[PDB]
Design a protein around this ligand. Structure first.
Ligand SMILES: *[C@@H]1O[C@H](CO)[C@@H](O[C@@H]2O[C@H](CO)[C@@H](O[C@@H]3O[C@H](CO[C@H]4O[C@H](CO)[C@@H](O)[C@H](O)[C@@H]4O)[C@@H](O)[C@H](O[C@H]4O[C@H](CO)[C@@H](O)[C@H](O)[C@@H]4O)[C@@H]3O)[C@H](O)[C@H]2NC(C)=O)[C@H](O)[C@H]1NC(C)=O
Ligand SMILES: *[C@@H]1O[C@H](CO)[C@@H](O[C@@H]2O[C@H](CO)[C@@H](O[C@@H]3O[C@H](CO[C@H]4O[C@H](CO)[C@@H](O)[C@H](O)[C@@H]4O)[C@@H](O)[C@H](O[C@H]4O[C@H](CO)[C@@H](O)[C@H](O)[C@@H]4O)[C@@H]3O)[C@H](O)[C@H]2NC(C)=O)[C@H](O)[C@H]1NC(C)=O
Ligand SMILES: *[C@@H]1O[C@H](CO)[C@@H](O[C@@H]2O[C@H](CO)[C@@H](O[C@@H]3O[C@H](CO)[C@@H](O)[C@H](O)[C@@H]3O)[C@H](O)[C@H]2NC(C)=O)[C@H](O)[C@H]1NC(C)=O
Ligand SMILES: *[C@@H]1O[C@H](CO)[C@@H](O[C@@H]2O[C@H](CO)[C@@H](O)[C@H](O)[C@H]2NC(C)=O)[C@H](O)[C@H]1NC(C)=O
Ligand SMILES: *[C@@H]1O[C@H](CO)[C@@H](O[C@@H]2O[C@H](CO)[C@@H](O)[C@H](O)[C@H]2NC(C)=O)[C@H](O)[C@H]1NC(C)=O
Ligand SMILES: *[C@@H]1O[C@H](CO)[C@@H](O[C@@H]2O[C@H](CO)[C@@H](O)[C@H](O)[C@H]2NC(C)=O)[C@H](O)[C@H]1NC(C)=O
Ligand SMILES: *[C@@H]1O[C@H](CO)[C@@H](O)[C@H](O)[C@H]1NC(C)=O
Ligand SMILES: *[C@@H]1O[C@H](CO)[C@@H](O)[C@H](O)[C@H]1NC(C)=O
Lengths: 372, 81, 372, 81, 372, 81
């Protein structure tokens, strides 16, 4: 075990402290560095496994060796010595730009920085498939792990004398969180009179028993056997938005849409939910047009009323009723209209704040006035 | 949980669900980036280009090595404390 | 004519339904696939047109055939057999990586996925100019169409036995929407005493008769003959921001600027509108400095008072007056001050919301207080 | 419409206007990506590399084919209606 | 000295006017353009300096010349005339695509546009290192300047007769802004009962005596000797968030965190600030567990109570006390809970505005209510 | 200024400070992109490819030149006024 000299270090984040201590476990001892240095100055291949008997295997990658071995060396006997240097010099400078881009001052906090294997592609010679193979990284979860950027490297040693960087790379293991379901949501517009509206809900939500939370899909990959995320995708949802998803329609916000909205119908449980006041709904079998009542906002089409329906020039056959008939608008409590844009939010928030400021005197006199 | 009955009355439906998997890492391998190529068979035809390449590399490598040593000097055996 | 079995399909988005039906008309028949498979297994070029009379012309693209025909085959008599495999093996792996990037697990819904021709550039051999030519895509609008990402491809057939993908490519036609004008807006700062302010308005707005809406420029290219958009760019503007643009200045939000702001003068309609309290305005003709009174927020410079004005060290000649002389601050209704950053928004929104709960009992006893 | 008079009094002006053009698709062409190169003139110097190449492609192409099939099985003639 | 004719120009931004005038002193005069065209014709190198006596040096870059001299010319005796043309044609088309990408219709307002040297890399032959060397751009500040993208180019002259583009390029110098300190902030979660909360503060803030402002790190590069920014990084901070940073804790907003938060302890001034109610805190020197009182939200560990502490599986040594030991929750006034997501903001803002609309009649009855 | 004492009671600390430097420019150099390669040693094996290359370039260069000409013609000597 080791102890961090926190009094001497002074200030450090949890990420820096953790990665600093993990550096003790992941760094080679000085004897390995001396043997590794001698091993490195014996190889001439782009990828080579160096096996120090009694210690774990080390993979060595040279980023311009293929070009030298495949292009420059065979050309030695028929090109001038000066052109060979110009051709290698072109590649070395291009390689340096990648090393500068990856390990330069843009790389903030080298100790706690994690670099994906794909970002290492150019430094490894342009492709990573051979490296993953020689690392033994394979299986049925490779695509889900790789596309979600799940293979991270970490710098453990930098050798200025012999010009090499040691990285620590790990192949992750996938584990399912029990009781967590990621739901994908989709919406359909509806009409109130001549105005077309759309309910504002998250694209993805997650549930765990009673609890509902937001879901961040940026680091996730949706595989057929489940979503695979390389970070924490779960993050809290505001209490008012949770009331929306729990059945309070007045808590859900709504927004106006453009004149060319393309989400005016959906197929759900073999039934068609369509804004027939905004698209042309016709019953194919009987040939009559399905009209949407002005006191209704949506149409729920099932086979009990129309076995086969045409919606936008597309003919659709629908199954048994899984959604009841549309109810009147007076039985649905609708939420507040909003605009989601950055400048629209600022203009409206500024108006609301100014209104609160102007009435500050009366709001800060409520207890007395209600007790008169 | 999610009240799908009221969500459909305002045109919101679920089109699919999936299980949630995260990542944990147990074993670690070492990958070393050998920055200096083997140029033995090029017969001294790239000396200037190699030296200029090394000069540019030093300007990137030294700040990172200094950062590693600064943290490593703060790691001490627990037996001493 | 085809029908969709909604009960069997169960759940589907409108985009999925539309794209899926389009497969019926856009697919090659079972016989055409068999003849295509034979034609592909006799070509040796990177781009070739397949002339199957009675059916539309097919363009075949091989992503590594240029390298084989230009580099490997000519060098056959000078390289060893093993080196030939190593050189090709490198290109195949990089090509596979690009194919995995395009069509792998990151490609969420292959059926309704639309892929721009630029994104297919590496899959097509690195460059798309020869493909656009062989497809017959040319004309005076190609640059506007191409730079808007307007040439999209759909996946129609994937053959695992003979390893090819069939795509449906289309060249759009441009049409002008009648009575729609896209306006570009620019602003300059103004001083209220010692504080420099800026009005918050969208960069682009669109008008149709008396209607004002937001304009999304992300998919658009501003050509000399009009703005060319590959998507619908118009989206609704909040009513409060519409009041601003209709001449209600009190509905317009304003924000402070940094001490090194760049928009402090503008040339408009031959006149110079400048914040002469935050920059140096000098009349070049007489050498007298143009000073802005503290009861005025902007200066409107025309030739009737200064034929030649120098601002920020730039000498400018102006025309006849087409803006009024600046009016006093007390004749301008100014809007609320706002901070647009997401954290500034959240800090101010959370404070404003918190003030609403403290008055919740007061706001419910509204009709009781107002009636009595 | 836009009141340019009041907008200039708080430092807002229009610096340009233009027409709005959108895109519509009329005809479609077929573009086939031939994934397997013609290697006949390369004798048999690429068998292992080609064989590895095909295996990697299958793990990508097969999921896409299944998605297409899962949609074209639900496409039926209107004559049945 | 020149004058701009604003009557003939009509409309222009300050950036356009400034860049339009600066074009006067940066254009090679009509005599040099004639001399330049002759000089360009006689060169056959990718990079070459044009030494015309009495006038500043001009660097000429040909983007495909390296490939011609290195790859095509040496192989003229072994390849056919047709294959030579096919190989160069492939490079020409790829080069044209990059020119179209840089200088095509996506380039809005070419006169006022600034292109960083890195963006021009492909147009210059794929690498900028040799161009910077022959431009004389070197020194101890290159790394910070280059990574901030501070070496900018502007189009000066375009000749369609001999097909060349003249650019004006400048190497900036760095100037410290006296009295400006950029502070980096980091946070640690605390617990109220069973819930884990987090204060919402900016990542970077900057001070100037009394004044505090936001800091935009997008164009900056944090170098060991200071922060180098290629644009104005300082922008105003809202008054309320200014109160937060000046010591008003109730002005600071706070958010619930995910169940797997990664910031639960921090090393600061040699002491550890740890949540200790969401992570295990144990004193190494005595083996006891550091338990957190439910009336306290944080733990401040110093050597006066625990010389060596093990937290989250890492053993850390701490120095003397430099933070007051934690106070009770009743002595800390906390701020409002907020949600930072765009959809959560819109949902809550829409709810807050609606309560304001529902309470209008009461708000404009304030003066009757307050006075009477 | 920043009250670090109250900030620590809600879990906010400073983890580093630095000075602020901006950029200013005084001297400028001329960098010319030569778009037409020297192909003399290639005999005449690239006639068609070069000519097709020039045609593509003019469709990009001509609109840029016209914008520069528009601004320059509005620049006039200061002594004229
Ligand atoms: C699925 O969707 C349905 C349909 O919307 C939901 O039913 C709604 O439920 C909400 C929330 O419970 C109801 O809203 C509340 O209704 C209460 C009953 O009001 C009745 O009595 C008043 C008398 O004045 C009548 O005017 C009115 O028409 C109703 O018949 C009220 O007590 C509530 O008002 C109170 O709101 C807040 C309290 O926090 C304060 O301002 C006041 O105290 C105020 O009194 C409120 O309006 C709503 O009525 C229901 N909709 C109907 C009946 O059409 C289901 O709940 C939902 N499913 C689930 C599982 O939640
Ligand atoms: C570092 O952090 C500390 C606390 O974290 C800050 O101390 C705060 O200082 C402010 C400003 O002085 C205090 O605000 C004022 O506190 C006074 C104390 O109120 C007493 O009486 C009430 C009523 O019983 C009790 O609730 C309270 O506990 C005290 O017994 C009051 O005089 C003020 O009341 C004001 O109320 C309203 C506000 O809306 C005004 O309209 C009134 O006119 C009146 O002024 C006010 O509340 C605050 O309480 C302190 N926080 C505490 C004690 O926790 C430091 O200022 C901060 N340092 C910096 C540099 O910011
Ligand atoms: C262009 O801008 C001018 C200047 O602001 C606008 O005039 C302003 O108009 C508003 C509403 O029309 C006036 O407010 C009104 O005041 C009276 C007096 O109490 C009251 O009847 C209304 O309830 C309302 O508050 C405002 O005073 C006036 N500005 C000034 C300085 O007097 C004008 O409307 C704008 N034009 C357009 C077409 O938007
Ligand atoms: C560069 O590569 C050459 C091979 O071309 C290396 O030479 C071999 O090194 C091994 C390693 O011990 C010896 O066993 C072989 O006898 C060597 N072969 C030949 C033909 O010399 C050489 O060591 C490398 N040089 C470096 C890394 O500087
Ligand atoms: C690979 O390309 C060769 C040409 O190099 C193809 O062979 C030609 O096939 C066509 C098609 O009928 C014949 O007209 C030619 O006579 C063939 N060439 C020669 C030299 O005989 C061949 O089909 C391709 N092989 C594949 C795709 O496996
Ligand atoms: C293209 O390059 C050729 C050489 O490849 C140039 O010809 C040389 O021009 C220089 C400049 O005056 C002379 O000093 C040399 O004597 C020339 N060499 C030969 C072999 O004649 C040529 O000027 C370049 N440009 C063109 C043809 O436009
Ligand atoms: C390269 O030069 C070295 C001297 O540093 C010499 O030992 C070696 O033999 C040379 N290589 C050749 C001639 O191939
Ligand atoms: C390549 O191998 C195949 C399979 O045996 C056969 O055509 C023949 O042996 C070889 N053909 C060549 C070298 O052209």
């Amino acid at each position: 075990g080791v102890v961090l000299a926190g009094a001497a270090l002074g200030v450090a984040t949890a990420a820096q402290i953790t990665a600093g201590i993990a550096l003790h476990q992941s760094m080679l001892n000085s004897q390995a560095i001396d043997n590794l240095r001698a091993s490195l100055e014996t190889t001439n291949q782009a990828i080579e496994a160096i096996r120090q008997a009694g210690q774990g295997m080390i993979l060595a990658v040279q980023g311009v060796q293929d070009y030298i071995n495949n292009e420059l060396i065979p050309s030695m006997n028929q090109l001038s010595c000066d052109l060979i240097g110009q051709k290698l010099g072109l590649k070395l400078l291009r390689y340096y730009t990648e090393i500068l881009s990856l390990f330069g001052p843009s790389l903030r906090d080298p100790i706690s920085a994690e670099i994906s294997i794909q970002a290492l592609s150019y430094a490894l010679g342009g492709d990573i498939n051979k490296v993953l193979e020689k690392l033994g990284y394979s299986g049925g979860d490779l695509l889900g792990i790789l596309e979600s950027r799940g293979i991270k490297a970490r710098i453990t040693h930098v050798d200025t004398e012999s010009y090499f960087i040691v990285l620590s790379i790990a192949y992750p293991t996938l584990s399912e969180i029990k009781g967590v379901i990621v739901h994908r949501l989709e919406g359909v517009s509806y009409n109130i009179g001549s105005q077309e509206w759309y309910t504002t809900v998250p694209k993805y939500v997650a549930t765990q028993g009673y609890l509902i939370s937001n879901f961040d899909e940026s680091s996730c990959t949706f595989m057929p056997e489940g979503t695979v995320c390389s970070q924490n995708a779960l993050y809290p949802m505001s209490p008012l938005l949770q009331e929306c998803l729990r059945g309070s329609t007045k808590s859900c916000a709504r927004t106006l849409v453009s004149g060319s909205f393309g989400n005016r119908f959906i197929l759900s449980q073999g039934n068609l939910i369509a804004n027939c006041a905004s698209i042309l709904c016709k019953c194919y079998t009987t040939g009559t047009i399905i009209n949407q009542d002005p006191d209704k906002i949506l149409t729920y089409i099932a086979a009990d009323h129309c076995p086969v329906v045409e919606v936008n020039g597309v003919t659709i056959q629908v199954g048994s009723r899984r959604y009841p008939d549309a109810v009147y608008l007076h039985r649905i409590d609708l939420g507040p209209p909003i605009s989601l844009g950055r400048l629209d939010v600022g203009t409206n928030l500024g108006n609301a704040i100014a209104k609160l400021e102007d009435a500050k005197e009366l709001l800060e006199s409520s207890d007395q006035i209600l007790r008169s | 949980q999610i009240h799908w009955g009221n969500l459909s009355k305002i045109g919101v439906v679920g089109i699919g669900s999936a299980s949630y998997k995260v990542m944990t890492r147990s074993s670690h391998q070492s990958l070393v980036i050998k920055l200096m190529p083997n140029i033995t068979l090029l017969n001294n035809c790239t000396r200037v280009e190699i030296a200029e390449y090394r000069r540019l590399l030093r300007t990137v490598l030294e700040p990172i090595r200094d950062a590693l040593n600064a943290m490593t000097q703060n790691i001490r055996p627990v037996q001493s404390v």
